[PDB]
Amino acid sequence: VRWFHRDLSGLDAETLLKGRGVHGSFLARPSRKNQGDFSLSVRVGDQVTHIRIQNSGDFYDLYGGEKFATLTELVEYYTQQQGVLQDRDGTIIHLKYPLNCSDPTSERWYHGHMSGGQAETLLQAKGEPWTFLVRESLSQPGDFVLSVLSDQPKSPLRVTHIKVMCEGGRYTVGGLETFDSLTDLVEHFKKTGIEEASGAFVYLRQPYYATRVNAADIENRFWEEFESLQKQEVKNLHQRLEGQRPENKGKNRYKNILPFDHSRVILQGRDSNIPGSDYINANYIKNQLLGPDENAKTYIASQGCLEATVNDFWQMAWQENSRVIVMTTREVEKGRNKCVPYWPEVGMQRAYGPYSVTNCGEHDTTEYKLRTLQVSPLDNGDLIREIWHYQYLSWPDHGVPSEPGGVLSFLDQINQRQESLPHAGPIIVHCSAGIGRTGTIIVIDMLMENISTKGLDCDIDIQKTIQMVRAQRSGMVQTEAQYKFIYVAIAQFIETTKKKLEVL
C-alpha cells in the first residue's frame, strides 16, 4: 500500500506524477477535511487524471467503476485489468505502476500526536539515555519535533528537543542538508548523531515504545491513527477464490466484496456434486490475540442477505448452533436496499428449506428491535431451538451515531443473552456488505469483553484488535468515523464499569 500518500494535495500529485512517474503511474490519496473521500491519481500519457472514491460507511465507491472492501483490493482489481475504469470525459483509464512514498505513519519511533510534555515524561520515565521519539508540532502543523533523551541531569535526565521544518515537500531540522521524507531524516541522524541548539551532541540510539495502554479515556479530549492502519492491508490480502465461482455469482450482494477462503463459513450437508453449493458470503471471526487457554465469545460476519441466500442463511445459523443474530441496518435505507427480510411476521410461520422459523414476538427500544424467534427442522418439529434477533434501527445512513450509549445497550443485551445460554454457538453479525458497521460492532464487542473478563488494568489495543479482525474478513471497519466511534464507545464503557460504587 506504498502507493498511499497521507498528506498530498491533488495539485501536488500532478506535480509528483509528472516528475517521477510515467504513463500508467498511479497513487492513492485522501481529501483532507472532507470525510468519506479519497482520490485516485492516474497518469494518462502526460496528463494527470483524478478519480474520487467515496466511502460513507458500507464500502469504497469508485466513480465510473464498482464497489470494493479496501483500497488495496480496489487497486488489485483494476490492476489485474479485471474491469473497465473510465472517467466522464476521458473514458477508459489504465492502472500500471504504483508511485510509492515513505510514510513513517507506522514507524516504531513515530508518535506524532504526542506533546512535548507527555514526551519528556515518557522518555525520562524509561531513563535510558539516547532514546529518541518524533511528534507532530502543535505550534505549526506540517512540521514535527525530534525529542531525544540526553545523558545530562536536569534529578531525572534532560530531554533535548529539536525542530524539523518542512520547506515545501523536503525536510530540514535547520542544517543545510534537506531530506526526502521524515524517515530519511530519522535514519540519517540515527547514525550521524545530531548537534542541538547549544553545542551539545546527541544520539538517536533507540526509539520509544510503550505498552501500558488502558485508561484510553484521555485520548477522548485519529485521522492519522487511522491511515496508519491503512498501510497494512497488504498482509491481509488472502484468497477469496471460492466467492468467485460463476455459480456463487448470485450469492453475492456486491460483486467484489467476498469472504476469505480460510475463514469462510461452509454450509454443511450439501451436494458435493454441485459446483458451488456450500457457499455463503460469510466468515468466522475470533479474537486471535488470545491463547487456547483463554475464554471469549466468537462471531460470524455476513453480508446483507439476498432472496437467493435467505435459506442458505438459515442453514448457517442452524448448523452453527447460533443462538443470537445481530442486524446493523434497516432492510432499505435512503432508497438503497441493505438486506431482504428472512423472518415471518409476528405470529406467522414460514419455512426456509429444511427449517421452520416462527416469529414468537417483537420488543422495541428507541434504537432497536428484538424479535424472539423459534426455529426447528421440519423433519422434526419437536427439536425447537430459541434464537434471538437483534436489529439496530437508528444508525445514521451517513456517518456514525452521535453518542455511543445506544450501541452499548444493544451490545450489553446481546452479551447477557449469549452468556446466559448453555453451550451456544458464535453470534451472527451482518448488515449490507458486512464489513463496516458489523466490523465496528464486533470490535467494540471484543474490547468490551476483555475489559469485562480481565480487569480495567488490561491492555486495550484498539488498532491491534482492528488489524486482527481484518485478517479474517476484508474491510472490517471502513471509515475514520467508525474508528473514532470505537474509541468513544469504549471510553464510555470504561467509565461506566469504572463506576465509583465499590461493590467490589
Curated annotation (Swiss-Prot):
Phosphorylated on tyrosine residues. Binding of KITLG/SCF to KIT increases tyrosine phosphorylation. Phosphorylation at Thr-372 by TAOK3 leads to polyubiquitination and subsequent proteasomal degradation. Ubiquitinated after phosphorylation by TAOK3. Ubiquitinated by a cooperation between ITCH and WWP2 via 'Lys-27'-mediated polyubiquitin chains resulting in the reduction of its association with LCK. Residues 3-99, 109-208 form the SH2 domain. Pfam families: SH2, Y_phosphatase. Its main location: cytoplasm. The modification Phosphothreonine is found at T372. Residues 222-493 form the Tyrosine-protein phosphatase domain. Keywords: Cytoplasm, Hydrolase, Isopeptide bond, Nucleus, Phosphoprotein, Protein phosphatase, Repeat, SH2 domain, Ubl conjugation. The keyword Nucleus applies. One of its GO terms (molecular function) is protein tyrosine phosphatase activity. It is found in: Cytoplasm; Nucleus. One of its GO terms (cellular component) is membrane. Its EC number is 3.1.3.48. Isoform 1 is expressed in hematopoietic cells. Isoform 2 is expressed in non-hematopoietic cells. PANTHER family: TYROSINE-PROTEIN PHOSPHATASE CORKSCREW, TYROSINE-PROTEIN PHOSPHATASE NON-RECEPTOR TYPE 6. Tyrosine phosphatase enzyme that plays important roles in controlling immune signaling pathways and fundamental physiological processes such as hematopoiesis. Dephosphorylates and negatively regulate several receptor tyrosine kinases (RTKs) such as EGFR, PDGFR and FGFR, thereby modulating their signaling activities. This is Tyrosine-protein phosphatase non-receptor type 6. The lineage of its organism: Eukaryota, Metazoa, Chordata, Craniata, Vertebrata.
